[PDB]
Amino acid sequence: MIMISILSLLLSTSVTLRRDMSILFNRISIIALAYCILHDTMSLSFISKGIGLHGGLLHITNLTQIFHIFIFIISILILQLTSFYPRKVWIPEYSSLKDIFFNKILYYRTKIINKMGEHMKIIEYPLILLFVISGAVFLISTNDLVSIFLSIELQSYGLYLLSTIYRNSELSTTGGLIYFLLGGLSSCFILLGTSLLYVNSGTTSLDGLYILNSISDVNSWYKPYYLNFSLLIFSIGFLFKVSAAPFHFWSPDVYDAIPTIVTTFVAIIAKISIFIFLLELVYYTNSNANSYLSEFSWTYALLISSLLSLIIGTVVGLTQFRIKRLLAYSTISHVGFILLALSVSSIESTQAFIFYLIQYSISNLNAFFILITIGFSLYGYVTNNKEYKSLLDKNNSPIQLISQLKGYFYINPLLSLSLAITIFSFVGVPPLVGFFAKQMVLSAALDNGYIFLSLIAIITSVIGAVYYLNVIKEIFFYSPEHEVNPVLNESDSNFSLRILNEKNVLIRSVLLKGRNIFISSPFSITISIITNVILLFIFMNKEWLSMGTILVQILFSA
Amino acid sequence: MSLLYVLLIIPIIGIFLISTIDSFYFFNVSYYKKIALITTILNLIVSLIIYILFDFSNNQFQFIQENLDLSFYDIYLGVDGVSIYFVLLTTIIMPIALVSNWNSITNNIKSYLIIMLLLETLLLAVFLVLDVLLFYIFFESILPPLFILIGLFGSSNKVRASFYIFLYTLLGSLFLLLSILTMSSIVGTTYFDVLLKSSFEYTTQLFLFFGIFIAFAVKTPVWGLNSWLLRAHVESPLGGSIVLAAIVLKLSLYGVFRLILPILPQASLNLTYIVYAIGAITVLYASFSTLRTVDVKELIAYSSVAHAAIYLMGVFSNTIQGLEGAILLGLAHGFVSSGLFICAGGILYDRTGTRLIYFFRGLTQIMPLFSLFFFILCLGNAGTPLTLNFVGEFMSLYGTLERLPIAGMLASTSIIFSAAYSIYMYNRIAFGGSVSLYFIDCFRDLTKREFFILFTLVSFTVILGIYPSFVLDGLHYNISSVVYGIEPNASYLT
Amino acid sequence: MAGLQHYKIAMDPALVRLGSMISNRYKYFRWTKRTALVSFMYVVVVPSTIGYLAYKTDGLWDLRAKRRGDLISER
Amino acid sequence: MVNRILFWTGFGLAVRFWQLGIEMRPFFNRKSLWAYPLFGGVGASFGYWLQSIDEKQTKMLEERKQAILEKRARRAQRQAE
Amino acid sequence: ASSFVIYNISRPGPNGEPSSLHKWFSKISDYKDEWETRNTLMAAALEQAAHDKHLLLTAER
Amino acid sequence: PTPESEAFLAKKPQVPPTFDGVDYEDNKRLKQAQDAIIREQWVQVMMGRLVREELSKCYYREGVNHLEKCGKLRERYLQLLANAKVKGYLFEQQNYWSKEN
Numbered sequence A: 001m002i003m004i005s006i007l008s009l010l011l012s013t014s015v016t017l018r019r020d021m022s023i024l025f026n027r028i029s030i031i032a033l034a035y036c037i038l039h040d041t042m043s044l045s046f047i048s049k050g051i052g053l054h055g056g057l058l059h060i061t062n063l064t065q066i067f068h069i070f071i072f073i074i075s076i077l078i079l080q081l082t083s084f085y086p087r088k089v090w091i092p093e094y095s096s097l098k099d100i101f102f103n104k105i106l107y108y109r110t111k112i113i114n115k116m117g118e119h120m121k122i123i124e125y126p127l128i129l130l131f132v133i134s135g136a137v138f139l140i141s142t143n144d145l146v147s148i149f150l151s152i153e154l155q156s157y158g159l160y161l162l163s164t165i166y167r168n169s170e171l172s173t174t175g176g177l178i179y180f181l182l183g184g185l186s187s188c189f190i191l192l193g194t195s196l197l198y199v200n201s202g203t204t205s206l207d208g209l210y211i212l213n214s215i216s217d218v219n220s221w222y223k224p225y226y227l228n229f230s231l232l233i234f235s236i237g238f239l240f241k242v243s244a245a246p247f248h249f250w251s252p253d254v255y256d257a258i259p260t261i262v263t264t265f266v267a268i269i270a271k272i273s274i275f276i277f278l279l280e281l282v283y284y285t286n287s288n289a290n291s292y293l294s295e296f297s298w299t300y301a302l303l304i305s306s307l308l309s310l311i312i313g314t315v316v317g318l319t320q321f322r323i324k325r326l327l328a329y330s331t332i333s334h335v336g337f338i339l340l341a342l343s344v345s346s347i348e349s350t351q352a353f354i355f356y357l358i359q360y361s362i363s364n365l366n367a368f369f370i371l372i373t374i375g376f377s378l379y380g381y382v383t384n385n386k387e388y389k390s391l392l393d394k395n396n397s398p399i400q401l402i403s404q405l406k407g408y409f410y411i412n413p414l415l416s417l418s419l420a421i422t423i424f425s426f427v428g429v430p431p432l433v434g435f436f437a438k439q440m441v442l443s444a445a446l447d448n449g450y451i452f453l454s455l456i457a458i459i460t461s462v463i464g465a466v467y468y469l470n471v472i473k474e475i476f477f478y479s480p481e482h483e484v485n486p487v488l489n490e491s492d493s494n495f496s497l498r499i500l501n502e503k504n505v506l507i508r509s510v511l512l513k514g515r516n517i518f519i520s521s522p523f524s525i526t527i528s529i530i531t532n533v534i535l536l537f538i539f540m541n542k543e544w545l546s547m548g549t550i551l552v553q554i555l556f557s558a
Numbered sequence B: 001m002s003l004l005y006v007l008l009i010i011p012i013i014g015i016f017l018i019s020t021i022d023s024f025y026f027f028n029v030s031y032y033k034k035i036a037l038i039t040t041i042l043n044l045i046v047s048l049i050i051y052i053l054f055d056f057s058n059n060q061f062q063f064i065q066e067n068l069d070l071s072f073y074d075i076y077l078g079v080d081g082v083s084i085y086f087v088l089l090t091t092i093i094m095p096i097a098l099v100s101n102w103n104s105i106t107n108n109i110k111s112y113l114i115i116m117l118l119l120e121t122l123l124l125a126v127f128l129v130l131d132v133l134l135f136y137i138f139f140e141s142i143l144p145p146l147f148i149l150i151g152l153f154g155s156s157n158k159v160r161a162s163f164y165i166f167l168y169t170l171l172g173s174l175f176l177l178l179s180i181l182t183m184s185s186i187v188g189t190t191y192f193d194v195l196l197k198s199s200f201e202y203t204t205q206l207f208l209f210f211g212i213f214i215a216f217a218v219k220t221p222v223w224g225l226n227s228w229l230l231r232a233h234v235e236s237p238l239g240g241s242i243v244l245a246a247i248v249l250k251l252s253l254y255g256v257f258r259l260i261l262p263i264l265p266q267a268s269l270n271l272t273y274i275v276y277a278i279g280a281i282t283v284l285y286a287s288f289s290t291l292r293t294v295d296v297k298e299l300i301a302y303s304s305v306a307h308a309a310i311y312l313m314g315v316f317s318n319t320i321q322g323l324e325g326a327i328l329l330g331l332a333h334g335f336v337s338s339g340l341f342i343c344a345g346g347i348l349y350d351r352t353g354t355r356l357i358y359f360f361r362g363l364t365q366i367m368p369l370f371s372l373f374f375f376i377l378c379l380g381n382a383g384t385p386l387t388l389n390f391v392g393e394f395m396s397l398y399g400t401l402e403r404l405p406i407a408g409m410l411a412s413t414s415i416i417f418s419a420a421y422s423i424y425m426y427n428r429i430a431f432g433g434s435v436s437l438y439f440i441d442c443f444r445d446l447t448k449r450e451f452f453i454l455f456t457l458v459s460f461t462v463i464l465g466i467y468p469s470f471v472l473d474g475l476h477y478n479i480s481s482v483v484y485g486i487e488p489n490a491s492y493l494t
Numbered sequence C: 001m002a003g004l005q006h007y008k009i010a011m012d013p014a015l016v017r018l019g020s021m022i023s024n025r026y027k028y029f030r031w032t033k034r035t036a037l038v039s040f041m042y043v044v045v046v047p048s049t050i051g052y053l054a055y056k057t058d059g060l061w062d063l064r065a066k067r068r069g070d071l072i073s074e075r
Numbered sequence D: 001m002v003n004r005i006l007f008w009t010g011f012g013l014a015v016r017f018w019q020l021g022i023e024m025r026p027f028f029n030r031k032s033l034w035a036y037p038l039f040g041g042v043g044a045s046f047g048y049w050l051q052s053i054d055e056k057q058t059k060m061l062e063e064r065k066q067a068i069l070e071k072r073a074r075r076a077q078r079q080a081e
Numbered sequence E: 001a002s003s004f005v006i007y008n009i010s011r012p013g014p015n016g017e018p019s020s021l022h023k024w025f026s027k028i029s030d031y032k033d034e035w036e037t038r039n040t041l042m043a044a045a046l047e048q049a050a051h052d053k054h055l056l057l058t059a060e061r
Numbered sequence F: 001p002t003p004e005s006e007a008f009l010a011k012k013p014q015v016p017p018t019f020d021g022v023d024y025e026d027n028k029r030l031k032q033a034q035d036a037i038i039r040e041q042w043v044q045v046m047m048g049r050l051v052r053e054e055l056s057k058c059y060y061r062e063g064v065n066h067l068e069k070c071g072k073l074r075e076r077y078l079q080l081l082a083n084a085k086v087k088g089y090l091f092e093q094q095n096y097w098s099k100e101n
């Protein structure tokens, strides 16, 4: 279905040059991904460690199909950013169901809703978006060394294209160059690792590699050192793509330079596909008998990177003043927790891994959604701050500095509380979902004898909390630097709105002002659902946690 | 709907009404303050109904509601003697905290009341949960509302204060969380009725003890880990300060009864000489330090440190008297420290705008109602008899002396220095010359509001100081369950 | 000065300056011979002394119902 | 106090409340009042669905536990020799 | 005056039979075995719940 | 003997004060055992309270002759002071001991 949509969208896109079609194409991509969820919901009625498909080059598991749906749902939520205008006009005289569904309203919308904004004029943006999704879901379902390489390039090349698709921004083309150049080096290490597996084992099949690993784990002439060493080189390339330390330098630069709406997709979708792919490869290569194999296990690169990410993510975030660089470093610290759970290969840690990945993706999505919504809300506000005037790409990244959030609690108190809840979920304060995620990882690491890493995880968490608190302090402890726009409410600056019936006949005529210009419903509702999932998780945890419990039992089923 | 769940629900309804009433009526700020106050009053009324029905000699948790729809993280509530009086202290204190700020907020009043009401639900949840992870979840849930209370309504140095109280508490609690997770892994559950039944191995108990004690020492606080209290309790708004000193300090004390006395008795017995050295050091170093403190609220904040050391020494005495004294002193300190913060942060700081003790002199001449209550609270802070502060200090110190005499004698010396710093402060403020020449305007005496939030606090300490049996009657059988030891001829009856 | 208007005080500059120096003093602490010895006396020795005496004498005595011909020493 | 329908009816009610507060739109204007039944109706539907999911999850987890005691039994019985 | 009045009328009287209001406060707070029944089922249910997790968490890889 | 009041019917321990034979899995019986431990300890101690009470009346009634007339009441308290102390159930619950050792 994703492939039919890509081909069908491309054909419809090929024969048009109208940039006013961009919003419509984004909405059709939402509809198309909804069918993809339907076809994969249909496919979960079986219990198996895996079914190889299509000549054995692909495979399907219950885990694979669950995370296809999650990738689809995250992509639908993100696609809203380019499918609905950021602002709307609301009035009590056009709020009934008979109104929204039988009557129409008319006003000069173009300036109010930013009809011609850059993020509403890119025809091919939803199409490159679906290309990345195809690479991500193919990587999850990959069963072969060549399939691994093709899927990772497919996802990677699309992300480079998305970082540059805003071709008139000097920042975006610069960020696209950086990701491609360092990303291309990372892809050599993946190809080198895959090639070294093939030249030694004689197979591109992951099944066969697992069989070779399993027999060689006994307790002479062809001792299989290649498998751990190759997967070590192979894993390093995947650590770059999740921005794990010490391979993380690119992301604070790339995430800040590319537009925020692009950053939302680019910084979320890629970690889910790589981590899920790594999870299975960690399980089937994990030696049981303490032999010479286990001492050279490639998974120490994951444990070292988790350690290095816990320190770099929290320490370096202390001095960041630009909000997008802070989120990049906040992400690095969270992949430190994710990588600890992947490294401990226990039933408990795999449940913790599965839960942590989903809740962090939801939470990081909220932070970006709140940050974009605050940017779209400042339209009716002005400021005289000299720092804000000297910012580059203000239209692509309206909020660039933490100081821009100063006194946002006095501009929109409830939206500021949603930001605070999300950030407090990042620190791990109970009873927020973020706490329960960190709690499961720590309990699983503690139960497996990972005491030293568990202690560094708690210590770095206090350091990380400092810059989290620093964002909250700017929003709540100070009065804002933004003033409401005088000419929007000046007792005579009122624009007109017509309310018309099914037959385009006038019903009423109302004069409106800037205080009638609100945030669009898609963004407020998405923030409201996710914020309440974060806050109220303790009453809704049974099904969500039981899903991962069952998934791990299938994976571990002796 | 259990009475205990009613306790957690009323303050949430008050939050709903506070934040929606404008859609039904520009609403006046007086309305919000009246909704919040009545909300806390009905919560107090429910806690009094529970106490009438409460049974003093039952080893079953009372007023528990059957869930039976088990999930991963379920909230079970129940109450026995050790938790019943902390619940009452929370319900009595919070209305007084609301009145103590009636006139002194003047901005973001909706946010102040919603934060104050939420803090009540969380703090009550701490004392009512029947699970060790549930305990931790509520002990920590109060940091973000506490962080935002100080920053929104605190004094000049409220940024450094809010960071200190957040990061100290989190860092210590993270070590308590590690200890709690080890317990749940070995036992499979943190529910009280089945975790206390278990028996941990000595070295496990040893490492479980450090993790928990590191958190309880940051929260006591012990001397040297008390920077956060010096900053937060002073920079906080008056209502925040009352809640912080009279309720939040008690969570570590109540947590010693549920997390270490029943499960870690060997570790507690073998490590008392370390707890007592820290407890003895805190009694002396804090007492000497508050003698030289020049900010009136910091002097009163620093007194909390010295008294918290005394009931921290009591809970580790393994004696019936020390444990009863520790709860009675923690309760007594709740009323008296609340009154002393109202006297300093509410009465003096609203009149003068400063808290430096250098500027005050002879206040008795113009303010005889303030001095009358201030003296009675300075007597109670000195452990004078007919205050609940003496009964708690004497019972807490007797247990400390019997368990380990060298620490008892040193902790006893606090009878001198508590008096010393309490009366010395009292004289430099109420006595010690005529009215300070720095005051240009004359000052008015207690308003009716100030008189009645002090009369209420001095009534509770005095009545409980003459008849402490009201509280001791509901602690005798439950306190007995946490004692560890046996007599030569009573053990192993046949 | 604060949110709620207070009475007019003769805010003495010297006393105001003294109360600010105290609140800012922590920023100027330094490690020297004096400050290292005092900080080592209060934090280590005196506490470890009490800990030594508490450890050494834990269980040394019991006073309960002691009579003539029966000592107080328990160990 | 964990009822799937009551909780999720309220969750949908809370989503609408938080949404209107985020938009800084009035919480209760009479022409918009159809939305709370709608939000709570969709919320109730999500929780009837979660009911069926929880039922199937319970059956499958219960089946897995039996397989786990079954595996331990036939391994222990094999060790009797 | 109220303290003198209330104490006198609350006495059990020359005989050991309780007052009219004394019997109400005992009937309402009966709980003869209610806390003993409810607590036992909760403890047993959570003990089994801890057992099921112990099975799943320790399953052979 | 003093008749057993209605109050001293609802709180009588139906079980002996011991932990031998108790299945710690079964909650009712373990809780009853803990109840029997504590109540026996408290019952033994209030004996000292009544003996102390009687000795007080004896002391005043006898004045200077208290050193010679109140002897039996003196010793009975001293024995109780030597033995009776609420020590809890927790040690005995967690530590079995046998006399045939």
Ligand SMILES: CCCCCCCCCCCCCCCCCC(=O)OC[C@H](COP(=O)(O)OCCN)OC(=O)CCCCCCCCCCCCCCCCC
Binding pocket: A413, A414, A417, A420, A421, A424, A430, A431, A535, B008, B015, B019, B110, B111, B114, B115, B118, B121, B122, B125, B141, B142, B144, B145, B148, D021
């Ligand atoms: C028993 C388990 C309970 C689990 C949690 C259940 C929910 C608990 C409460 C969570 C948050 C609820 C928020 C309730 C207030 C929402 C209504 C509202 O809009 O209040 C607005 C209020 C004032 O703003 P306003 O009046 O609009 O502007 C006037 C300017 N002149 O502005 C405010 O009131 C903001 C108040 C400050 C922020 C709240 C205190 C800090 C909270 C930190 C959030 C993250 C941690 C969440 C912890 C939840 C409880 C543990």
Ligand SMILES: CCCCCCCCCCCCCCCCCC(=O)OC[C@H](COP(=O)(O)OCCN)OC(=O)CCCCCCCCCCCCCCCCC
Binding pocket: B466, E003, E004, E007, E008
């Ligand atoms: C600072 C105070 C410190 C107090 C410390 C504790 C007390 C020790 C010091 C006082 C010593 C004597 C105390 C009073 C003893 C007598 C109390 C009394 O009034 O009893 C009479 C009344 C009925 O007698 P009754 O108990 O029924 O006898 C048969 C029962 N078998 O019994 C009653 O129940 C009636 C109770 C009436 C209310 C109490 C009366 C108190 C009298 C002293 C009041 C002092 C405060 C004055 C307040 C301001 C007055 C202007």
